Design a protein around this ligand. Structure first.
Ligand SMILES: *[C@@](O)(CO)[C@H](C[C@@H]1CCNC1=O)NC(=O)[C@H](CC(C)C)NC(=O)c1cc2c(OC)cccc2[nH]1
Ligand SMILES: *[C@@](O)(CO)[C@H](C[C@@H]1CCNC1=O)NC(=O)[C@H](CC(C)C)NC(=O)c1cc2c(OC)cccc2[nH]1
Lengths: 301, 299
């Protein structure tokens, strides 16, 4: 079969802690002797409308922060601001720290989210970095500080820390350097994102995954040039496909025997005609949150 | 919006091992000093076509089993078969054993699956046990012995151990007592599942989830008996509701003030007259249980 699959979250669960400053509590990520968390933990409800973060942070001391790993309190021995995050130095190192890296994910790429509440892991799901730099996640009150990550041979690449839910229900956050993805700001305001687009490379990978798993009703005897495909794709708010993206689909094309441009012609027909009550891999819409890597990993190992 | 979400898998990852007999390898579950795994690990590829498990197990000794946590071997000191599983006693009690229970889930219930290969966890996803006793999973060669589970208050309830991929691409397995879900058997044969039906309980949970989010156009001024609903639902390939299903809907019914039977009358009208959108599609979702809805609406 074919399902949306997240990385096993164990390596990340062992890093989640709770951070409290006054009456504000959120999640933190404890790696070696540092705890990372969103900086708005230092704000009161009144500060959040227009916070002068450097001004608010200089008024805090080490004992202002209560850090808890389960029932155990970790003593904060230093603090510094890391863009929209705080870096809290603690007096003990996390023995459960995996091999890790901090990466800045690009639009179209996917990652797993470990949703946490009060320092306790609660759920794990897969998300994609949207072209408009939001993520379509599922986060409730207390989820700030939850992280997004990928795993490669026991190394955890952390790429996202959660901060905000927009009025439309989509989400905004930062990388682990504290830099927001997109034009968002950590202030208590209603913020709109730019117009989103469909991740074309991922839709094509998902159509290849459908062929690999028996679904091929949408295929046709036609072909298209890359430019003619891109003209139709842009008309429907889909990202243009570059020659680099065609090359990425090489392995999936060689596996199914379907040329990349032949799959583009099938997608062009789907965009123009529609699905007309039919389904692809159980879905009634074109799915764009599976990368070619996600498809290859799930079908081949 | 709603999405499939799995439980954090760490407590289960700490229990995954690999079990090998000859060149046949699969996954096992290590809890305290016992390792549970599919009994077909004792078969060569040719033995699987028509195996006599009792006879095949007589010639296996404790020294025949290679159990590994990573590349660390755990010595087997006892073995027994329990239905379609093997229970191997090992010389080491797993320090990472969470608080746990073994449960046999009912059709319609959801659970997380930790797909494993060679004892190494690879991915996690949420599955629903279909009324035909299959799951629409994603499994490759080497996935046998992967487990399904739910976590409630740091207690892991194990409910599924993977054994087979049917010719239609759906999957079959057993509970942690080795009893298959459905009429399947552990042999290398093409087996067919019965025709599947829609999980009525979960469609009702999805309607309550829509009401919780302010989408309530489909509610009507009538009610139905459970029997009248069951008779109409079966004409639409929907499962009949049981007293347990009505009980499970208790919290959602109290939260919205919609009696379960009043919601069945709304669903009955949707079935007989069609659909407009709900949350906000024309297709009703049947893989989110009443617990899944509460978990994503209330937190
Ligand atoms: C964090 O848990 C707070 O620590 C929280 C997570 C969201 C709550 C619900 N779902 C979530 O994803 N984030 C916030 O509450 C942030 C805090 C900022 C960065 C200081 N704020 C918002 O997400 C936010 C504020 C407003 C708003 O105002 C006025 C109006 C409309 C939307 C909105 N979202
Ligand atoms: C286990 O990993 C074996 O240890 C394996 C898992 C499947 C392989 C691929 N995807 C999976 O989910 N299970 C099997 O290979 C089982 C072994 C049995 C229980 C002894 N066999 C099947 O799943 C199986 C056999 C046949 C078949 O024959 C002939 C014909 C059609 C389908 C089919 N499935």
């Amino acid at each position: 079969g074919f399902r949306k699959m997240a990385f096993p979250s164990g390596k990340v669960e062992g890093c989640m802690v709770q951070v409290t400053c006054g009456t504000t509590t959120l999640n933190g990520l404890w790696l070696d002797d540092t705890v990372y968390c969103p900086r708005h933990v230092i704000c009161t409800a009144e500060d959040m409308l227009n916070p002068n973060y450097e001004d608010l942070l200089i008024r805090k001391s080490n004992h202002s922060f209560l850090v808890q790993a389960g029932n155990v309190q970790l003593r904060v021995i230093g603090h510094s601001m890391q863009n929209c995050l705080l870096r809290l130095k603690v007096d003990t190192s996390n023995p459960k720290t995996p091999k890790y890296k901090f990466v800045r994910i690009q639009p179209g790429q996917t990652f797993s989210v470990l949703a946490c509440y009060n320092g306790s892991p609660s759920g794990v799901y897969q998300c994609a970095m949207r072209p408009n730099h939001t993520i379509k996640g599922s986060f409730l009150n207390g989820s700030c500080g939850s992280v997004g990550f990928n795993i490669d041979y026991d190394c955890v690449s952390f790429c996202y820390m959660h901060h905000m839910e927009l009025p439309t229900g989509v989400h905004a956050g930062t990388d682990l350097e504290g830099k927001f993805y997109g034009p968002f700001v950590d202030r208590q305001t209603a913020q709109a994102a730019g117009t989103d687009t469909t991740i074309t490379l991922n839709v094509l990978a998902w159509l290849y995954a459908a062929v690999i798993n028996g679904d091929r009703w949408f295929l046709n005897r036609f072909t298209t040039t890359l430019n003619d495909f891109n003209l139709v794709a842009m008309k429907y708010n889909y990202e243009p496909l570059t020659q680099d993206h065609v090359d990425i689909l090489g392995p999936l094309s060689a596996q199914t025997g379907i040329a990349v441009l032949d799959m583009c012609a099938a997608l062009k027909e789907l965009l123009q005609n529609g699905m007309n009550g039919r389904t692809i891999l159980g879905s009634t819409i074109l799915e764009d949150e599976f990368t070619p890597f996600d498809v290859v990993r799930q079908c081949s190992g």
